[PDB]
Scaffold this active site. Structure first.
Site, PDB file in Angstrom:
ATOM      1  N   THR A  58       6.976  -5.573   7.243  1.00  0.00           N
ATOM      2  CA  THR A  58       5.938  -4.147   7.376  1.00  0.00           C
ATOM      3  C   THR A  58       5.605  -3.826   6.175  1.00  0.00           C
ATOM      4  O   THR A  58       3.867  -3.335   5.423  1.00  0.00           O
ATOM      5  CB  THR A  58       7.248  -3.424   7.179  1.00  0.00           C
ATOM      6  OG1 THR A  58       8.441  -2.872   6.329  1.00  0.00           O
ATOM      7  CG2 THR A  58       7.745  -3.562   8.599  1.00  0.00           C
ATOM      8  N   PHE A  60       8.297   6.617   8.372  1.00  0.00           N
ATOM      9  CA  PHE A  60       9.626   6.124   7.933  1.00  0.00           C
ATOM     10  C   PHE A  60      10.559   6.417   8.743  1.00  0.00           C
ATOM     11  O   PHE A  60      12.019   6.011   8.459  1.00  0.00           O
ATOM     12  CB  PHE A  60       9.469   6.294   6.201  1.00  0.00           C
ATOM     13  CG  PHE A  60       9.423   5.042   5.346  1.00  0.00           C
ATOM     14  CD1 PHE A  60       7.219   5.109   5.983  1.00  0.00           C
ATOM     15  CD2 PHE A  60       9.077   4.785   4.109  1.00  0.00           C
ATOM     16  CE1 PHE A  60       7.127   3.904   5.134  1.00  0.00           C
ATOM     17  CE2 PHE A  60       8.855   4.323   3.308  1.00  0.00           C
ATOM     18  CZ  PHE A  60       6.985   3.524   3.523  1.00  0.00           C
ATOM     19  N   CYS A 100      13.915   4.634   6.832  1.00  0.00           N
ATOM     20  CA  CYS A 100      13.793   3.398   6.521  1.00  0.00           C
ATOM     21  C   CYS A 100      14.424   3.580   4.807  1.00  0.00           C
ATOM     22  O   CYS A 100      14.206   3.460   3.496  1.00  0.00           O
ATOM     23  CB  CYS A 100      12.936   2.506   5.819  1.00  0.00           C
ATOM     24  SG  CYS A 100      12.618   1.543   4.794  1.00  0.00           S
TER      25      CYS A 100
HETATM   26  C1  MNH Z   1       5.545  -0.287   4.075  1.00  0.00           C
HETATM   27  C2  MNH Z   1       6.683  -0.322   4.505  1.00  0.00           C
HETATM   28  C3  MNH Z   1       7.682   0.528   5.697  1.00  0.00           C
HETATM   29  C4  MNH Z   1       7.247   0.605   6.319  1.00  0.00           C
HETATM   30  C5  MNH Z   1       6.810   1.666   7.170  1.00  0.00           C
HETATM   31  C6  MNH Z   1       8.573   0.670   7.374  1.00  0.00           C
HETATM   32  C7  MNH Z   1       9.566   1.451   8.685  1.00  0.00           C
HETATM   33  C8  MNH Z   1      10.976   1.490   8.904  1.00  0.00           C
HETATM   34  C9  MNH Z   1      11.462   2.260   9.571  1.00  0.00           C
HETATM   35  C10 MNH Z   1      10.087   3.206  10.865  1.00  0.00           C
HETATM   36  C11 MNH Z   1      12.511   2.318  10.084  1.00  0.00           C
HETATM   37  C12 MNH Z   1      13.325   3.726  10.866  1.00  0.00           C
HETATM   38  C13 MNH Z   1      12.612   4.001  12.126  1.00  0.00           C
HETATM   39  C14 MNH Z   1      13.788   4.064  13.031  1.00  0.00           C
HETATM   40  O1  MNH Z   1      14.560   5.380  13.653  1.00  0.00           O
HETATM   41  O2  MNH Z   1      14.003   2.807  13.855  1.00  0.00           O
HETATM   42  C15 MNH Z   1      13.424   1.470   9.514  1.00  0.00           C
HETATM   43  C16 MNH Z   1      14.458   1.222   8.645  1.00  0.00           C
HETATM   44  C17 MNH Z   1      14.557   0.601   7.752  1.00  0.00           C
HETATM   45  N1  MNH Z   1      13.853  -0.817   7.524  1.00  0.00           N
HETATM   46 MN1  MNH Z   1      11.877  -0.131   6.941  1.00  0.00          MN
HETATM   47  N2  MNH Z   1      11.631  -2.130   5.313  1.00  0.00           N
HETATM   48  C18 MNH Z   1      10.637  -1.886   4.304  1.00  0.00           C
HETATM   49  C19 MNH Z   1      10.193  -1.260   4.289  1.00  0.00           C
HETATM   50  C20 MNH Z   1       9.034  -0.524   5.542  1.00  0.00           C
HETATM   51  N3  MNH Z   1       9.527   0.140   6.741  1.00  0.00           N
HETATM   52  C21 MNH Z   1      11.303  -2.791   3.265  1.00  0.00           C
HETATM   53  C22 MNH Z   1      10.623  -2.961   2.895  1.00  0.00           C
HETATM   54  C23 MNH Z   1      12.758  -3.010   3.823  1.00  0.00           C
HETATM   55  C24 MNH Z   1      13.144  -4.274   2.813  1.00  0.00           C
HETATM   56  C25 MNH Z   1      13.664  -4.505   1.573  1.00  0.00           C
HETATM   57  C26 MNH Z   1      13.139  -2.259   5.033  1.00  0.00           C
HETATM   58  C27 MNH Z   1      14.684  -2.627   5.493  1.00  0.00           C
HETATM   59  C28 MNH Z   1      14.671  -1.823   6.639  1.00  0.00           C
HETATM   60  C29 MNH Z   1      16.074  -1.361   7.272  1.00  0.00           C
HETATM   61  C30 MNH Z   1      16.840  -2.430   6.598  1.00  0.00           C
HETATM   62  C31 MNH Z   1      15.913  -0.502   8.310  1.00  0.00           C
HETATM   63  C32 MNH Z   1      17.709   0.294   8.402  1.00  0.00           C
HETATM   64  C33 MNH Z   1      18.501   0.688   7.781  1.00  0.00           C
HETATM   65  C34 MNH Z   1      18.809   1.823   8.722  1.00  0.00           C
HETATM   66  O3  MNH Z   1      18.604   2.371   9.315  1.00  0.00           O
HETATM   67  O4  MNH Z   1      20.167   2.420   8.065  1.00  0.00           O
HETATM   68  N4  MNH Z   1      11.543   1.112   8.168  1.00  0.00           N
END
Ligand code: MNH
Ligand code: MNH
Ligand code: MNH
Ligand code: MNH
Lengths: 452, 452, 449, 451
Positions: free
Chosen positions: C263, C388, C395
């Site tokens: 992502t 996000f 996230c």
């Molecule tokens: C661009 C950057 C970026 C975007 C658009 C992004 C988008 C998302 C979205 C959208 C969700 C949850 C939506 C849902 O309801 O299912 C989510 C959950 C998550 N994300 Mn990320 N994410 C990152 C960067 C992003 N994340 C990075 C960098 C990491 C790791 C270091 C990461 C680790 C996660 C994790 C772990 C979750 C789940 C956490 C939780 O829901 O408790 N992330």
């Protein structure tokens, strides 16, 4: 000038091999054009002998010499300059031949036999543990048996292929590599990036194979070394003539070569022997009797497994009908004349169809197709040049006695401990992965409940 | 008369050259045959020299001149009129010598050193950024370093060879072409169907090298120039005698020769030196002290390399035991008697076994195989012409000071920033691509936490 | 409101393209704010209008639902924070454990290793020949993957030392590509898919194997590195009082590796694209990086001080998010939008790209890109900009991704100009996440440290 | 009545939310005391941690077996098997009177010869390993125990060692058990958050049931001159009813026995081996005893019965970490428990076995030290003090079956191998309704002794 199949423009005679069974299609072509027909891919030109009158002349070592087929050259990418894939002129061939041949003598076979026990047993009691509903895959189990056998005997490495239900990683990668080499003969253009994925696969597969070789060299180095395997002769053995051993590269190439060539052909042989014995329920009994009367013990010694004989007839006949190594190539040192009116320039390439040669009416009679173990009761009758599925002369198979001893041991033990019933009405399916193997062969064997 | 190795009839000694390791086979042959031995192949005769007293006469500028080896002749196709492959009675050799020699000097070395650091920093950072479990393939990573060093310094081009998992396309193609040179020398018959495949490949590989050179001239053509460099001295450099610049068509040949001869030899030297340092702990401890005391600042200075004494001694001793350029050939400029015992007609070709020359027990003591850098504590004491790893006279390696300067600088930083561990007690295996390099040599190098 | 139905396969055949999410975008511009994408054995409703979306995210009656794609991802991601329901024990537990690791102070902790990796990338771009061009998505995956490896697990992937993709990336894209291909498959029990399963399992093992490597590398070392891994191994959630079992942590390592590299690489690739397309917009970014960061290596405070690039990144997320959608379900039976009754457990799919293109809340020029549009973030109503996720399920690595993007992008822009010589036509490759394909650019350095 | 912290409307259910319910409850038992009250929505349970308060709980007069909530979720696929049956159930008395005798110590001698075959496979797989390889102890013990129970009782060979991955039955069964345990920690199961589990869960049952289909078909097709648990079931007329079991209950019993008869036993073997490797002197004593007592290539039944110290080590490992984490009962009418705690009719009563051994009043102090010398004489241990196999008529029927192989297999291992804890394993425990050390690995260099 010689008969040849039709020419497809600039592509010439190549695109006729465009199927999963190229070798099997060449037999159908040979029956038409005759004993020899010239074959011509782009650039490369070969000739395919199908009758002994001319194959015997091709086999004189002063006249002609083993040539690497277009497939074996592709094999060289992982096999390198090993015994199978090395030119007779590269010093590595004669060096490694004189170094490693002592391992296949009669005295070393006795040391290998007790290790063959482990894995023949290791197959038998697997089949004793199977339930009434389950059918057993003969090619898939024979491959396990043969690979474990070559590993433990010649390299003191237990693949433990019976402890995994699906093929060993080495087996999958190897079948991929051989399948790719057979498919590379196909490609009018291998240079196009359209096959780039294949290249990524090749290295990947080779990695696995190479990695396994590492495991075989890394353990023995740190292993408590009290054994004289093929591996000790590769690492520590010296050539009588050269006076010097093998280089690391060729050592790995020999290890790879022996794994592949030591299990694939032998498993195919056991599978074909079964196919013909399970297809003909009336050939089993004697053999069974043989084992039961020849093997006083459940576990046999080399004297006992050497004393059994009719198994030799049964097994030799499978290679006469279907050799697991279908062909070998030769070439002409000088502008000799072959079979009378056939003249060959220097370096002309010659292929020989072992199945179609063996399928000759003049020597073997009109009833070639019939699976008859009778023919081999006498070794003296057949001319030496008519029947040979292990190669010719000095380039004949080096591990022939090993292969056959293992095959008789395993097959006789099977017939000793089990009763095999064809419960699948199997239709013949011959998968070509550079070699001939029955595909999907499935039989089940009701146990005879013979203890150890 | 003159001893000679075993001749198999028509092909005489030539079949012996097929082995992966021709130079080592010739060393074995020299151990038994003696000071000098004849070596006759169909269409070519050359006498191999191993005793120093014959080497000193063969080396005289007023007695014998440089002759192109049979393999070097085939090397010409990509290298050509470059000095290493150019003739001594050749026009382009004299022009290029006079105008490229000023590009190697104290001032020149200063020009190249600051940029050398950069590449060595890439190496040090790669090894520092390896995980604990990983190991280092010394010859591979040394070729990786040497290409980038020579490229960035002498051609203003960064190969970026460190950012590649596999060897650079230039490395693959160069090694493969050298393969054909050597393997076609050993070849009995020049024409054969099969070789055509080979021939195809060798048109392909060469082109890559050609293509790569096209970047250096094109890149510098488009980007900013007028920064004193080898490529500058080739474009704008002018001949003092004739007032003529280099032929563009010949400038590209210069680039080929320099790129090729600047890494393989230096990289083989670094691998061999590290190997010998690993087999003896004390000889390392001394050099690890030297690098620390001499190089204080994080980046080595142009003066700091010359201040390193023990590093150069280690390099010279490792180069003594296994000279990376294994041999050179020389033809007689007039009728002479060599040693007063062997009469030679003018133009006769003699090859010189440098590694066998260094192993002469009379000069280097009766423990020649022993690797002790201390021999070069007083390099003045070494007899004349006994130690000629870089060549002889005018014909000897215009950039040998660059070879030593890069190798010493790099090795100083390597011993400064790292701790070397040998996990396999590596069995010395020498792969030959007309040049000697260890094969399978893998070590680990723990970090010493030193900046930049 | 529903698209065309083909046999008992419902509308599933409509997702049988290279880019399913793009087809969904077309379908909601065609069919309006909401539409039901019925499928055989699974029914969901795609939502694209801020008026309904803002209501949908309130956690009173709404909880995160694992979409079909996430259900398929559960085969390798397992019980991790991304593929577990809020009700699932490991989400609350391990989220409480790992949330302290994403504090601004912890972020400062990550900054240094992040700067190491960013300077590695800037080096590869500083050793560029005039002939050479860079492949932005391919190199950006390297940057982000090495960043997460080193910062969260202290494991150096050495992806930049590989011109070929890392084995982890190859196997992971095969597994994720399989997750996307399993949606369109009409029947999964077909024997002709048996092969597809083997490589899938193959693809998983690689990943798992690499994960195991990390745990070995950590075990024998100077144990002085604070990251996600040390927390997961030894950390304890106050309410639960317990650490994570051995089997969960492997899933968490996989989860973070994937979610941190893909992502984020997507975000920076799209942002570079948008900066390239609009010269003025890009001029300000280079200029703000110059004025705000004077030091050779960015300080944490200086990264936070950058605000034009924050606008650029948020606006790139507006036009093109890297996580294409998130799925929620109704906690209890309720009615949404006033015209739609929804039983308990009926799931919705919030389509992030169309939500950002709602003309009412962002103005009509939704297709037009301008970072200036984010000149006041509180001016924008709630849930207008939701790339996000919603609430607690948003996230957990929001600030980590933003810090990497801001820092690295500032370094890139300050160090040199970027030139789209290729005039590449934007093609978005869809592999569970939105990533451009073939985007290649040449950037000639300003020769600064 | 001491209660842990009621977080909210969900009573105190968040206390078991952690994956290790027993370990958390054990910490809670150290802090809260001898008995504490744990109530969920629609149910209240009593967790007993004291032998004096458990003493009254043991008596069948006031307490009888009640299916716990977890076991009630297991009953869906387990049916009315012996484990998930009520005491006041027509099938419990039937299948008990019919299958209680099959576990006779005299009937054990018939099991022994097949019970050593699977152990031969275990010893062979370890012996045939290459030097670079290592053994996953729990993962291999599960193969051994599954094949053991299947072959001895049903004459079916799973061939778990011939499959590199766990058996299909194993994966589906672990998912079913994990599912039944997961359903415990849910405020309301009705929502479609984990309704997806319901398909998956049901799917699992199929596999198990489907595999059981094979076990009915192999016995009828081929000749079956074998006396075993399944043969007893097949015929098996109860003397009280005068009537055999129906195939509704037969498959349930097969499934019950498979699960309950390999899971716990592989757990026991793994725990005991971990303890042996952590304590070198106890190991050395037991391994040398295995050498002395086992002088045959194939062990004899008398030799397994002769090993006192191997059984003592097994009992000490069971005492510290019982594979069965808890058993539950129900009360008869109103009674006073402990003197301080009164209870109405049908009040739930769940005994926490692991914490029972931890209390000082019996084993004295140093309850956490693994000392197999606590079982020197069986009589000096207070009766009722040690209850890892259940209670009364609801005690484990397989207590005889588990220990034999456990003493045999373990013994065999100690005879043919020297074990090395290369990982210096940091203890981690997994509880899919049964306790087993997760990820515990050792290297085993052979003693080159034939078989
Ligand atoms: C661009 C950057 C970026 C975007 C658009 C992004 C988008 C998302 C979205 C959208 C969700 C949850 C939506 C849902 O309801 O299912 C989510 C959950 C998550 N994300 Mn990320 N994410 C990152 C960067 C992003 N994340 C990075 C960098 C990491 C790791 C270091 C990461 C680790 C996660 C994790 C772990 C979750 C789940 C956490 C939780 O829901 O408790 N992330
Ligand atoms: C079935 C049994 C079996 C068959 C039909 C068989 C067939 C052949 C044939 C045909 C050739 C000649 C190939 C050619 O192009 O000329 C050959 C060569 C070879 N074979 Mn075997 N082979 C084995 C078993 C067989 N080999 C076994 C077992 C081993 C290993 C122990 C083995 C190792 C070799 C080697 C090595 C060569 C190459 C020998 C040489 O060139 O010196 N083998
Ligand atoms: C190790 C380091 C190293 C060794 C052992 C080495 C060995 C040799 C030997 C031997 C010769 C003479 C060959 C013959 O047949 O007479 C030679 C000539 C040459 N070498 Mn260099 N050489 C280098 C480093 C080495 N060279 C480096 C580094 C460069 C480039 C920068 C280089 C470029 C040359 C060139 C150019 C010649 C040709 C000299 C001439 O013919 O006038 N080099
Ligand atoms: C060590 C190994 C081992 C332990 C600690 C063990 C522990 C127990 C405990 C505790 C109970 C009581 C559960 C309850 O809720 O009341 C129980 C009941 C049971 N166990 Mn077993 N059990 C086995 C091995 C063990 N069991 C084996 C092996 C088998 C099968 C051959 C088996 C078959 C049962 C059966 C059946 C029951 C149910 C008996 C009943 O209540 O009627 N077993």
């Amino acid at each position: 000038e010689m008969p040849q199949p039709k020419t497809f423009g600039e592509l010439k005679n190549l695109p006729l091999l465009n199927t999963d069974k190229p070798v099997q299609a060449l037999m159908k072509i040979a029956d038409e054009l005759g004993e020899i027909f010239k074959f011509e891919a782009p650039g490369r030109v070969t000739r395919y002998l199908s009758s002994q009158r001319l194959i015997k002349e091709a086999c004189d070592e002063s006249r002609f010499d083993k040539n690497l087929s277009q497939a074996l050259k592709f094999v060289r990418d992982f096999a390198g300059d090993g015994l199978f894939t090395s030119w007779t002129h590269e010093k590595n061939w004669k060096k490694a031949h004189n170094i490693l041949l002592p391992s296949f003598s009669q005295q070393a076979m006795k040391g290998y036999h007790a290790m063959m026990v482990d894995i023949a047993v290791q197959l038998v009691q697997k089949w004793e543990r199977l339930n009434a509903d389950e059918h057993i895959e003969v090619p898939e189990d024979m491959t396990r048996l043969t690979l474990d056998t070559i590993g433990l005997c010649g390299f003191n490495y237990r693949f433990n292929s019976f402890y995994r239900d699906q093929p060993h990683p080495f087996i999958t990668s190897m079948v991929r590599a051989l399948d790719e080499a057979m498919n590379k003969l196909q490609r009018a253009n291998p240079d196009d990036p359209a096959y780039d994925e294949n290249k990524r696969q090749f290295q990947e597969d080779i990695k696995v194979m190479n990695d396994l070789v590492d495991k075989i060299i890394a353990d023995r180095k740190a292993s408590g070394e009290q054994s004289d395997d093929l591996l000790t002769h590769m690492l520590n053995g010296k050539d009588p003539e050269t006076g010097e051993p093998l280089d690391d590269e060729n050592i790995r190439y020999q290890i790879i070569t022996f794994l592949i060539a030591g299990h694939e052909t032998t498993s195919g042989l056991l599978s074909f022997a079964l196919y013909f014995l399970v297809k003909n329920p009336h050939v089993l009994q004697k053999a069974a009797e043989e084992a039961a009367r020849v093997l006083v013990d459940p576990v046999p010694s080399y004297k006992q497994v050497k004393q059994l004989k009719y198994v030799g007839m049964v097994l030799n006949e499978a290679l006469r009908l279907w050799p697991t190594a279908p062909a070998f190539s030769l070439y002409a040192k000088e502008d000799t004349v072959l079979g009378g009116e056939y003249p060959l320039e220097k370096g002309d390439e010659l292929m020989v169809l072992i199945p179609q040669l063996h399928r000759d009416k003049t020597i073997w009679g009109d009833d070639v197709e019939e699976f008859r173990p009778e023919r081999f009761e006498n070794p003296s009758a057949i001319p030496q040049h008519a029947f040979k599925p292990f190669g010719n002369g000095q380039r004949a198979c080096i591990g022939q006695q090993f292969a056959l001893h293992e095959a008789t041991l395993v097959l006789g033990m099977m017939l000793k401990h089990f009763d095999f019933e064809d419960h699948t009405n199997y239709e013949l399916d011959i998968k070509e992965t550079l070699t001939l193997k029955p595909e999907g062969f499935v039989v089940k064997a009701k146990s005879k409940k013979i203890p150890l």
